[PDB]
């Protein structure tokens, strides 16, 4: 309730670039505090690349300029230079670079989940996906494509789309979700920044990272599960190594489920199942302590959840589930459920920790409903944490102050909070609105 909603800061990008599809805080120290915005449809100065996508750096102080991860066009096949006509070995056009943007310390991870390549054998069109990792404040740039392996095509990791979802741990470990691996069984892959740089050799296209953790191929009964559709991190195993939370929205007869994996050996620890078929339970996941007991609690979104009005009419509203952790573990059934009230509102499409917004000792949460509102522009709900868990009523409701237009705004489809952008002691919030190519920054004012 202490976010400055009457006058937020609006960042604007190029038209049609989907500027705001992904948002993130960047701070190599404190002096260079900045906002990162992904624009997956942005045109770039890369030669021969159409709408390669871009990431914009927006320093906070007094605007936005694109970061140059890769200035090169699509590389050429080795043996094509023998034949009559050079041909690309990869396809960076329409790769959606910047679909996911995450940062940890002076490192920035930007992913292109629709990046595809030919392979150097039989011609394919494998969307293996790729990520670029900047380190030490843009002094070294690395490419990281863990799914670009010996095992090609849908049967292997050819359609992995690695980087479709991503996140950093507290130690800076990279965690990637690739929902397309092994006939869309899905896959989690992870490697330390040291491990990635140690085996980085751009002359060879295939990934050779040693010590890399990754989930294993299962039987065909698990196909089309989209494991790794969304990802988050949090401690759930009782040690000091953050664990991996992964959404599996089409698992178990498309009732969907969320899984927690051991950050040490990626082995499965817990499962949480949805309550309705094709509700997309696991569309979005988050981990944060919402009741100040020191144990990270789980939040899951199911934006297609369909309930009935009192007069008997069905309606798509969406629903969020909260699982409170306790010293013995976690219960499979939710402690609390939050239900949207806007038809086709898609409540629970995005979730982000807010830290402690009002400094009352309990961390708070923001939940997006990209198509909520009286004009379907989108809405963001702030829910207060407390000793009994998250509150069932919002403490604040954020909406765009600009008028609706010919196209949806998608306001609230991308969220990021839990960090202090201006150093006033109160955490702040970034809201994406890529439909109109805008990102909004809400600041926490000291209030009562």
């Amino acid at each position: 309730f202490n976010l400055d909603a009457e006058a937020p800061a609006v960042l604007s990008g190029p038209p049609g670039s989907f500027f705001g599809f992904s948002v993130e805080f960047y701070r190599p120290g404190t002096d260079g505090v900045s906002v990162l915005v992904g624009a997956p449809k942005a045109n770039t100065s890369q030669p021969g690349v159409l709408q390669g996508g871009a990431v914009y750096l927006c320093p906070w102080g007094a605007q936005c300029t694109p970061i140059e991860f890769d200035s090169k066009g699509s590389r050429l096949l080795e043996s094509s230079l023998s034949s009559e006509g050079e041909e690309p070995v990869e396809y960076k056009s329409l790769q959606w670079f910047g679909a996911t943007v995450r940062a940890h310390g002076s490192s920035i991870l930007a992913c292109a989940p629709l990046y595809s390549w030919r392979t150097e054998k039989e011609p394919l069109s494998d969307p293996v996906g790729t990520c670029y990792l900047s380190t030490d404040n843009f002094t070294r740039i690395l490419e990281y494509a863990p799914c670009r392996s010996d095992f090609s095509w849908a049967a292997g990791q050819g359609y992995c789309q690695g980087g479709f979802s991503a996140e950093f741990t507290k130690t800076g470990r990279v965690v990637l979700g690739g929902p397309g691996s092994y006939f869309w069984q899905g896959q989690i892959l992870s490697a330390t920044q040291e491990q990635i740089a140690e085996s980085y050799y751009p002359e060879y296209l295939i990934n050779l990272v040693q010590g890399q953790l990754q989930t294993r191929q299962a039987s065909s009964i698990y196909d089309d599960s989209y494991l790794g559709y969304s990802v988050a991190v949090g401690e759930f195993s009782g040690d000091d190594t953050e664990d991996f939370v992964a959404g599996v929205p089409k698992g178990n007869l498309t009732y969907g489920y969320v899984t927690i994996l051991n950050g040490s050996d990626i082995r499965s620890l817990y499962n949480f199942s949805g309550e309705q078929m094709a509700s997309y339970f696991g569309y979005a996941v988050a981990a944060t302590d919402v009741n100040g007991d020191g144990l990270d609690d789980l939040l899951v979104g199911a934006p297609l959840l369909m309930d009935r009005t009192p007069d008997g009419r069905p309606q798509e509203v969406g629903r969020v589930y909260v699982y409170l952790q306790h010293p013995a573990g976690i219960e499979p059934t939710p402690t609390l459920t939050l239900t949207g009230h806007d038809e086709f509102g898609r409540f629970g499409s995005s979730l982000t920790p807010l830290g402690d917004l009002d400094q009352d000792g309990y961390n708070d949460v923001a939940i997006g409903a990209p198509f909520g509102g009286e004009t379907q522009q989108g809405v963001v709900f702030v829910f207060p944490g407390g000793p009994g868990g998250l509150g069932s009523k919002p403490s604040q409701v954020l909406q765009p102050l600009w008028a609706a237009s010919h196209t949806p705004d998608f306001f609230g489809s991308a969220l990021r909070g839990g960090r202090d952008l201006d150093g006033n002691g109160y955490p702040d919030l970034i809201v994406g609105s890529f439909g109109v190519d805008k990102a909004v920054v809400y600041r926490g004012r000291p209030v009562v």
Partner: protein, 427 residues
């Protein structure tokens, strides 16, 4: 009681606070004038003095149920219009009579998966047009049939996008045609021979991921109206496949984020916006299938029965059948589904104003009486059978001072009952 505890300062306030309250006008009564209808006479209040406005029920349109007639000339529900004046907290109940028509036309649209796993199936359907039309001849005197095909969204990663695989998504020997979202091969017609002719020309296709994009097609069939040629009769949509289904959210893998708009986008009988709009959600299909009165028959293989069994529970007016190896049993499947769908009625009402509530009580054959959510439906309704519903409406506020109106209708029919509401707020 709550009549005295209301402290009614006028005749008006007394009415909206409790249905059991009356107002004394005598001036010989020793806010105490607002008491129970019994508590006033016990205190010496003349009945000619106790003002007590009461709700009422007035039928306005009441064509009797029917027993050579056009579909619009057939009455299956009565009354068709009535007025209910509502006292706050006092329910008004009225009877709804439903009768299943003797002979009613049928539109059946056959929407078929033409992905590669449906290769052997397409060969058996070569005579489905004339064979089905023969069977329906002993069910209805007016039958029409249509045919549509679907595969998948025409974008990465759902299809392979190499130039060769775009021309032929299958192997070299296999002469598969290019992948396509949805094709309206044949609009509804009474010529079964044309169905055989055009279905016999269609070519099997293919794609990459096992779940297919039939939901995009179902949506189009549901909302495209005249392009399909739906009549205001029994509308059957047979959905034949051997795979699971994509739904909203799956589109995001291909960068498709716009929700389905539920609008018609056929150009040259081809769906042209599969690359632009995401797959519909089940809830979105529920809305549009119901709105356009489409009754869905899911003719799916044995292994996907569990999935489509759950889908049927979510979709009103839908049925599931086990499709044989290559659609050899599809006709009997359709007949069994129709008999099941037509023998059950389900009532739905429009949105009510806040403070207003509705309740159903069904009275079916063999003395089977339903209440709660079961009060909305009757089953085992044979041809010519009559069932009745007792429908109560109660207002607990004073919504507006203007009259409200909403419709009650059985799913799958244009016929409806217009219920006009009027609220007693003053004496």
């Amino acid at each position: 009681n709550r009549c005295l505890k209301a402290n009614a300062k006028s005749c008006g306030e007394c009415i909206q606070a409790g249905p059991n309250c009356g107002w004394c006008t005598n001036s010989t009564f020793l806010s105490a004038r607002c008491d129970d209808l019994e508590a006033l006479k016990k205190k010496g209040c003349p009945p000619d003095d106790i003002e007590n406005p009461r709700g009422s029920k007035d039928i306005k349109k009441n064509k009797n149920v029917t027993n050579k007639l056009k579909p619009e000339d057939i009455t299956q529900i009565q009354p068709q219009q009535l007025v209910l004046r509502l006292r706050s907290g006092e329910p008004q109940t009225f009877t709804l009579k439903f009768k299943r028509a003797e002979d009613y036309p049928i539109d059946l649209y056959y929407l078929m998966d033409l992905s590669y796993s449906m290769k052997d199936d397409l060969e058996n359907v070569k005579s489905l047009g004339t064979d089905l039309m023969n069977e329906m001849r002993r069910i209805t005197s007016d039958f029409r049939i249509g045919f549509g095909s679907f595969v998948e969204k025409t974008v990465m990663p759902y299809i392979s996008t190499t130039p060769a695989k775009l021309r032929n998504p299958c192997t070299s020997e296999q002469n598969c045609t290019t992948p396509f979202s949805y094709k309206n091969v044949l609009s509804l017609t009474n010529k079964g021979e044309v169905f055989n002719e055009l279905v016999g020309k269609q070519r099997i296709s293919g794609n990459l991921d096992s779940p297919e994009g039939g939901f995009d097609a179902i949506m189009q069939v549901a909302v495209c109206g005249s392009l399909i040629g739906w009549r205001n009769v029994t509308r059957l949509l047979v959905f034949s496949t051997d795979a699971g289904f994509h739904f909203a959210g799956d589109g995001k893998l291909g960068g498709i984020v716009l929700p389905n708009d539920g609008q018609c986008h056929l150009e040259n009988n081809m769906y042209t916006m599969s690359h632009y709009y995401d797959y519909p959600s089940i809830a979105h299909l529920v809305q549009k299938l119901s709105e356009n009165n489409i009754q869905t028959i899911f003719a799916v293989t044995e292994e996907f029965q569990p999935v489509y069994k759950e889908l049927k529970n979510l979709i009103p007016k839908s049925a599931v059948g086990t499709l044989s190896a290559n659609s050899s049993n599809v006709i009997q499947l359709i007949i069994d589904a129709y008999n099941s769908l037509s023998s059950e009625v389900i009532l739905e009402n429009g949105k009510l104003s806040e403070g207003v509530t509705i309740s159903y009580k069904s009275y079916c054959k063999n003395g089977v009486n339903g209440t709660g959510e079961n009060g909305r439906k009757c089953s085992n309704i044979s041809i010519g059978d009559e069932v009745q519903f007792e429908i109560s409406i109660t207002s607990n506020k004073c919504p507006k001072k203007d009259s409200d109106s909403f419709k009650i209708r059985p799913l799958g029919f244009t016929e409806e009952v217009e219920v006009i509401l009027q609220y007693i707020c003053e004496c």
